[PDB]
Design a protein around this ligand. Structure first.
Ligand SMILES: [Fe+2]
Length: 633
């Protein structure tokens, strides 16, 4: 008969089922899906009704009703709100901030049921405040990109401070008492736009398929926020560059009229319309870097690359496949729905990068140029939590000062990284006993080469040592589960109230410093998507509904805990400690530990949360009970 080679037959089959994209769609490498149509996914990785065997599907990922609703908004291309979606009162109707804030609180119940259960930052009256704004850079949806300010970047702000004759603010930077930066000036470099070109998205009105002359513009800014970190451990915003353009000579850079959190000035924080605008512009900058870079690229897309490469090279039954496999549950169908609807029909629509909405060529669209560049400029090893916290300038290993008490991400993760490495170290070493044993493995070398080339993650290691294999496996797990968890499952809260953190601006920037300095509420109210005017209704809905959709809380069984308890691979409907091949006494002992380590950690993440400055919003996101096995939303 014809000769049968079980392995090479199975891999030949997987390399047909799991194929790469040619990249003509304008996305980083992913699983090839003809027109991203559900049907053209691999049979098992498709979607069934909720309460089904895993050989059928993965259960309805999103909330049926709020998908049909969000799809309704994306499809709605008419500038006149459709009869269906329209209501007597809406959270964008206003027409004032007061009226919009007043609506928000009246939608808190006792339907909207996530990890904050229908609640948002709108609960806090003083969300505008310097503490709550800045606190989002430690505890918000993007806690992982703030870093120590380069000495020669302080040198710029020392100069601009002097230029404005602000003698007080100069002395603060002069010495350099824990001066930190959050830098979105890279958006230009990232989109190939010149320093004379402004970010503008021209939203063309269509009569279904055919356009009418009518348009409305949304705007975006390569902002740069400068913070000082005090000893009591409060992150204080000092300065915002609204849109950085090579130098601060060519940009308009405002300074906080209160130079500390306790500072008192006769103009309040609520009435400081110049500063409340700047912060709102700096919020659009972080919305982008969060959704594109920190969320979509760094988690969803990096994980898909691993999934595809791992499936193509490493066979089902191999140890590496079995530890990684569970952390992929339903990731592929979700990215196929992101690439189809969410990225083009929402992200690229509500963002201010443009150049147009809708787009006919995504390779020409800037949101896609940013998606592409974010993937290209990711670094697999540098975002190892230890290496992450080190290079960004955070010594969590030994801070006696207690200055990082307001930074629970940095606290929670430094612990949680070692714990997941502990687990992997025990399981990997149960087969991979030496650097040599790794070197003489068939798949690990080709696994790396596949990821470094086709996956287009060159920063992925050439795995020689046992430590190198452990960190790589930790990272795949860390990215897929707790890192995605942190950045995914606080969207509803921080985005639901659109003014707190809006996706883009609905009016051009102020022309110069002198113009901004005399800004009224109506300017911000206009800049935000409020009123029946200029299709601002659609921008609000999408801005506050995508968060609620993607914040929809994880099911009990898709916990990191429930896995650590029983090692049950939800994704593959099997258990690793039922493969007589592997040294299972060890694996059961690693899992037994890993579980006791996580229960123990949930206690510490709690302490870190309540250990923050009085009033500071909680950080419950990395609670193992509320952490996802995979990138499953
Ligand atoms: Fe996500």
């Amino acid at each position: 008969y014809e000769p049968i080679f079980p392995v090479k037959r199975e891999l030949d089959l997987k390399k047909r089922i799991y194929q790469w994209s040619d990249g003509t769609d304008g996305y980083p490498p992913h699983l090839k899906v003809d027109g991203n149509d559900e049907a053209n996914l691999p049979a098992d990785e498709r979607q069934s009704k909720p309460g089904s065997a895993r050989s059928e599907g993965v259960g309805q990922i999103f909330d049926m009703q709020e998908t049909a609703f969000v799809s309704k908004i994306a499809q709605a291309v008419s500038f006149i709100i459709p009869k269906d979606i329209d209501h007597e009162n809406t959270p964008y109707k206003g027409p004032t901030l007061a009226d919009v804030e007043k609506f928000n609180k009246a939608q808190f119940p006792k339907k909207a049921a996530d990890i904050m259960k229908g609640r948002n930052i709108g609960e806090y009256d003083d969300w505008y405040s310097d503490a709550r704004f800045a606190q989002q850079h430690f505890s918000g949806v993007n806690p992982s990109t703030i870093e120590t300010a380069s000495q020669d970047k302080i040198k710029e702000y020392i100069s601009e401070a002097q230029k404005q004759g602000l003698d007080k603010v100069k002395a603060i930077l002069e010495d350099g008492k824990d001066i930190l930066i959050q830098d979105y000036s890279y958006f230009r470099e990232a989109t190939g736009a010149t320093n004379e070109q402004i970010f503008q998205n021209t939203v063309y009105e269509l009569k279904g398929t055919t356009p009418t002359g009518k348009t409305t513009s949304r705007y975006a800014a390569a902002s740069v926020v400068i913070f000082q970190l005090h000893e009591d451990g409060r992150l204080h915003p000092l300065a915002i560059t609204l849109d950085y353009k090579g130098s601060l000579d060519n940009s308009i850079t405002i300074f906080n009229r209160r130079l500390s959190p306790d500072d008192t000035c006769d103009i309040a924080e609520k009435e400081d319309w110049p500063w409340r605008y700047a912060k709102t512009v700096a919020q659009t900058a972080d919305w982008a870097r969060h959704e594109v870079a920190t969320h979509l690229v760094d988690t969803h897309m990096i994980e898909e690359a691993i999934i595809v490469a791992t499936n193509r090279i490493i066979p089902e039954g191999e140890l590496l496949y079995e530890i990684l496999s569970p952390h992929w549950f339903r990731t592929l169908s979700l990215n196929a729905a992101a690439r189809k609807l969410l990225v083009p029909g929402v992200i690229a629509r509500i963002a201010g990068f443009g150049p147009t909405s809708p787009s006919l060529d995504f390779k020409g669209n800037n949101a896609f140029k940013l998606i592409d560049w974010s993937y290209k400029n990711f670094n697999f090893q540098d975002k190892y939590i230890p290496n992450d916290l080190k290079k960004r300038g955070f010594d969590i290993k030994g801070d006696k000062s207690g200055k990082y008490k307001n930074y629970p991400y940095a606290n929670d993760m430094y612990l949680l990284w070692g714990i997941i490495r502990n687990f992997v170290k025990t399981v990997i070493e149960s087969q991979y006993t030496s650097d040599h044993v790794v070197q003489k493995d068939p798949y690990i070398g080709g696994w790396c080469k596949e990821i470094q080339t086709n996956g287009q993650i060159p920063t992925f290691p050439t795995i020689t040592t046992v430590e190198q294999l452990i960190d790589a496996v930790t990272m795949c797990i860390h990215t897929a589960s707790p890192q995605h968890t942190a950045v995914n499952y606080l969207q509803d809260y921080y985005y639901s109230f659109v003014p707190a953190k809006p996706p883009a601006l609905c009016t051009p920037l102020p022309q110069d410093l002198s113009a901004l300095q005399g800004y009224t509420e109506k300017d911000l109210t206009a800049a935000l998507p409020i009123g029946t005017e200029d299709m601002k209704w659609k921008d609000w809905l999408l801005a506050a509904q995508l968060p609620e959709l993607l914040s929809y809380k994880v099911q009990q069984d898709y916990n990191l805990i429930t896995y650590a308890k029983s090692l049950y691979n939800v994704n593959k409907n099997r258990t690793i400690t039922e493969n007589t091949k592997f040294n299972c006494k060890t694996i059961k002992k690693a899992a037994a530990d890993f579980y006791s380590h996580l229960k123990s950690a949930g206690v510490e993440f709690e302490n870190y949360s309540k250990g923050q400055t009085a009033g500071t919003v909680e950080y419950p996101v990395l609670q193992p009970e509320t952490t996802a096995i995979s990138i499953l939303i």
